[PDB]
Amino acid sequence: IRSLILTLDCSEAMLEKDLRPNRHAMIIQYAIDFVHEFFDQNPISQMGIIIMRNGLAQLVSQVSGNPQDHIDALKSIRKQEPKGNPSLQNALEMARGLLLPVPAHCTREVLIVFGSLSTTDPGDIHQTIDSLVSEKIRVKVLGLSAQVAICKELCKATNYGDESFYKILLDETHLKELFNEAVTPXXXXXXXXXXXXXXXXXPTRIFEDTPTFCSCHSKLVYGGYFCPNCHSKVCSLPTVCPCCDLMLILXXXXXXXXXXXXXXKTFAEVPTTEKFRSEDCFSCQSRFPXXXXXXXXXXXXXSRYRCEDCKQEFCVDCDVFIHEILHNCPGCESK
Amino acid sequence: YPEQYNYMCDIKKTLDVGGNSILEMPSGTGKTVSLLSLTIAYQMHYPEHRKIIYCSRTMSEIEKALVELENLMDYRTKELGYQEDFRGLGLTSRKNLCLHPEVSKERKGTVVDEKCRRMTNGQAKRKLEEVELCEYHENLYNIEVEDYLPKGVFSFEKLLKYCEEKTLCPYFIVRRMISLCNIIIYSYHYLLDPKIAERVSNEVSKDSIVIFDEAHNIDNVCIESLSLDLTTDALRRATRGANALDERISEVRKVDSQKLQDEYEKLVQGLXXXXXXXXXXXXXXXXXXXXXXXXXXXXXXXXXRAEHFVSFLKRLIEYLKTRMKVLHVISETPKSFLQHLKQLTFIERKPLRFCSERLSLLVRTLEVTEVEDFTALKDIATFATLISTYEEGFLLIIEPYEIAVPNPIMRFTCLDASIAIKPVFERFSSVIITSGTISPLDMYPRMLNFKTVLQKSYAMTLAKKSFLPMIITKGSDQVAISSRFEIRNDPSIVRNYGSMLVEFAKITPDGMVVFFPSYLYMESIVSMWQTMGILDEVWKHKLILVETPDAQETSLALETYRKACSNGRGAILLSVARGKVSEGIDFDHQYGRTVLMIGIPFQYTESRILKARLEFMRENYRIRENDFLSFDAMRHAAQCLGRVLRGKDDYGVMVLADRRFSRKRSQLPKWIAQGLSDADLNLSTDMAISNTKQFLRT
Ligand code: SF4
Ligand SMILES: [Zn+2]
Ligand SMILES: [Zn+2]
Ligand SMILES: [Zn+2]
3-state secondary structure B134-195: CCCCCCCCCHHHHHHHHHCCCCCHHHHHHHHHHCCCHHHHHHHHHCCCCCEEEEHHHHCCCC
CB atoms within 10 A of CB A238: 19
CA nearest neighbour of A140 among A110, A107, A175: A110
How far is residue B91's CA from residue B158's CA, in Å, rounded to a whole number?
12
Give the three-class secondary structure for B434: strand
How far is residue B235's CA from residue B335's CA, in Å, rounded to a whole number?
22
B693 reaches A (C-beta below 8 A): no
**Vertex B513: Cα angle to B644 and B681 (nearest 5):** 75
CA torsion sign for A6, A7, A9, A11 is positive
The dihedral over CA atoms of B309, B314, B315, B321, expressed in degrees to the nearest 10, equals 140
CA nearest neighbour of B436 among B154, B640, B255: B640
The DSSP bridge partners found for residue B24 are B435
CA–CA distance from A53 to each of A18, A63, A82, A120, A132 (Å)? 19, 19, 6, 11, 22
Any ligand 1 atom below 6 A from CB of B134: yes
For ligand 1, the distance from its centroid to the CA atom of residue A185, given in whole angstroms, is 66
Listed as own residue / partner, the contacts of B677-681 with beta carbons closer than 8 Å and 24 or more positions apart are B677/B473, B677/B475, B679/B469, B679/B471, B679/B655, B680/B503, B680/B504, B680/B507, B680/B508
Any ligand 1 atom below 6 A from CB of B422: no
CA nearest neighbour of A70 among A59, A80, A81: A59
Residues B361 and B275 sit within 8 Å (Cβ to Cβ): yes
How far is residue B405's CA from residue B290's CA, in Å, rounded to a whole number?
38
How far is residue B53's CA from residue B184's CA, in Å, rounded to a whole number?
6
Listed as own residue / partner, the contacts of B394-398 with beta carbons closer than 8 Å and 24 or more positions apart are B394/B334, B395/B331, B395/B332, B395/B333, B395/B334, B395/B612, B395/B616, B396/B331, B396/B332, B396/B333, B396/B334, B396/B337, B397/B331, B397/B332, B397/B608, B397/B609, B397/B612, B398/B323, B398/B324, B398/B326, B398/B329, B398/B330, B398/B331, B398/B332
B687 reaches A (C-beta below 8 A): yes
| Binding-site sequence positions of B for [4Fe-4S] cluster | 98, 116, 134, 169
For ligand 1, the distance from its centroid to the CA atom of residue B290, given in whole angstroms, is 27
For B165, counting Cβ atoms within 10 Å of its Cβ (0-12 exposed, 13-18 middle, 19+ buried), the class is: exposed
Amino acid at A328: N
Residues B596 and B515 sit within 8 Å (Cβ to Cβ): yes
How far is residue B112's CA from residue B139's CA, in Å, rounded to a whole number?
21
HSE-CB of A64 using CA atoms within 13 angstroms: 13
Mutant choice from A112, A114, A168 vs B, greatest count of B C-beta within 10 A: A168
CA nearest neighbour of A201 among A133, A131, A273, A249: A249
For B675, counting Cβ atoms within 10 Å of its Cβ (0-12 exposed, 13-18 middle, 19+ buried), the class is: middle
Contact residues, B window 535-594, toward A, CB-based 8 Å cutoff: 538, 565-570, 589-590
**Vertex B580: Cα angle to B471 and B408 (nearest 5):** 115
* E-only strand ranges, chain A: 2-9, 46-53, 56-64, 107-114, 138-144, 166-169, 200-201, 225-226, 233-234, 247-248, 268-270, 304-307, 312-314
Residues B440 and B666 sit within 8 Å (Cβ to Cβ): no
Determine, for residues B687 and A145 on separate chains, whether the beta-carbon distance falls below 8 Å: yes
Way the structure was solved: cryo-EM
CB atoms within 10 A of CB A4: 25
How far is residue A48's CA from residue A70's CA, in Å, rounded to a whole number?
8
Mutant choice from B683, B687, B690, B696 vs A, greatest count of A C-beta within 10 A: B687
Which residue owns the Cα nearest ligand 1 atom 3?
B100
The minimal CB distance from B684 to the residues A118, A145, A152 is found for A145
How far is residue B258's CA from residue B89's CA, in Å, rounded to a whole number?
44
The minimal CB distance from B510 to the residues A117, A124, A164 is found for A117
Determine, for residues B565 and A150 on separate chains, whether the beta-carbon distance falls below 8 Å: no
Any ligand 1 atom below 6 A from CB of B349: no
Q: Is the peptide bond before A185 cis (omega within 30 degrees of 0)?
A: no
Residue B94 CA: nearest ligand 1 atom is 7
CA nearest neighbour of A86 among A122, A58, A118, A62: A118
What angle do helix axes B306-324 and B351-365 make, rounded to 10 degrees? 120
The dihedral over CA atoms of B190, B196, B198, B204, expressed in degrees to the nearest 10, equals -60
Residues B691 and A174 sit within 8 Å (Cβ to Cβ): no
How far is residue A201's CA from residue B515's CA, in Å, rounded to a whole number?
70
Ligand nearest to the CA of B99: 1
A141 reaches B (C-beta below 8 A): no
| B687/chain A closest Cα distance in angstroms | 5
Contact residues, A window 143-172, toward B, CB-based 8 Å cutoff: 145-150, 152, 164, 168, 170
What angle do helix axes B351-365 and B371-388 make, rounded to 10 degrees? 160
Residues B668 and B470 sit within 8 Å (Cβ to Cβ): no
For A133, counting Cβ atoms within 10 Å of its Cβ (0-12 exposed, 13-18 middle, 19+ buried), the class is: middle
The DSSP bridge partners found for residue B652 are B466
Q: Pairing state of beta strands B469-471 and B543-544?
A: unpaired
Question: Which residue among B135, B136, B166, B281 is best mutated to probe the pocket of ligand 1, counting the most ligand atoms within 8 A of its Cβ?
Answer: B135
Mutant choice from B540, B541, B589, B696 vs A, greatest count of A C-beta within 10 A: B589
Q: What is the DSSP code (8-state) at residue A331?
A: G
**Vertex B283: Cα angle to B280 and B287 (nearest 5):** 105
Chain B residue closest in CA terms to A148 = B568
| CB within 8 Å of B257: residues ≥ 6 apart | none
CB atoms within 10 A of CB B306: 22
A127 reaches B (C-beta below 8 A): no
Resolution in Å, one decimal place:
5.8
How far is residue B172's CA from residue B578's CA, in Å, rounded to a whole number?
36
Instruction: Determine the number of helices (DSSP H) and then strands (DSSP E) in chain A.
Output: 10, 13
The dihedral over CA atoms of B337, B338, B340, B343, expressed in degrees to the nearest 10, equals 170
Determine, for residues A125 and B589 on separate chains, whether the beta-carbon distance falls below 8 Å: no
Residues B383 and B413 sit within 8 Å (Cβ to Cβ): no
Give the three-class secondary structure for B455: strand
The DSSP bridge partners found for residue A166 are A141
Determine, for residues B569 and A150 on separate chains, whether the beta-carbon distance falls below 8 Å: no
Distance of CA A140 to the CA centre of its chain: 12
Q: Where are the alpha helices (DSSP H) in B285-436?
A: 290-293, 306-324, 334-344, 351-365, 371-388, 417-421, 424-427
Any ligand 1 atom below 6 A from CB of B114: no
CA–CA distance from A285 to each of A292, A315, B247 (Å)? 19, 9, 119
Give the three-class secondary structure for B583: coil
Any ligand 1 atom below 6 A from CB of B99: yes
Cα-flanking dihedrals φ and ψ of residue A296, to 5°? -75, -15
Residues A64 and A46 sit within 8 Å (Cβ to Cβ): yes
HSE-CB of A71 using CA atoms within 13 angstroms: 9
Distance of CA A35 to the CA centre of its chain: 8
| CB within 8 Å of B585: residues ≥ 6 apart | B60, B64, B591
Q: Is the peptide bond before B101 cis (omega within 30 degrees of 0)?
A: no
Q: Which helix (H) or strand (E) holds B467?
A: strand B466-467
Residues B203 and B179 sit within 8 Å (Cβ to Cβ): yes
Kindly write down the DSSP assignment for every residue of A29-49, as one continuous string. HHHHHHHHHHHHH-TT-EEEE
Q: In what order do the strands lie in the sheet with A268-270?
A: A268-270, A304-307, A312-314
How far is residue A287's CA from residue A279's CA, in Å, rounded to a whole number?
5
CA torsion sign for A29, A34, A40, A42 is negative
Pairs of CB atoms within 8 A across A/B: 40
Cα-flanking dihedrals φ and ψ of residue A13, to 5°? -65, -25
For ligand 3, the distance from its centroid to the CA atom of residue A289, given in whole angstroms, is 12
**Vertex A218: Cα angle to A213 and A219 (nearest 5):** 75
Ligand nearest to the CA of B97: 1
| CB within 8 Å of B342: residues ≥ 6 apart | B348
Question: Which residue among B114, B118, B134, B281 is best mutated to probe the pocket of ligand 1, counting the most ligand atoms within 8 A of its Cβ?
Answer: B134
| Binding-site sequence positions of B for ATP | 25-32
B696 reaches A (C-beta below 8 A): no
CA torsion sign for B378, B384, B389, B395 is positive
| B504/chain A closest Cα distance in angstroms | 15
For ligand 1, the distance from its centroid to the CA atom of residue B122, given in whole angstroms, is 11
Amino acid at A37: E
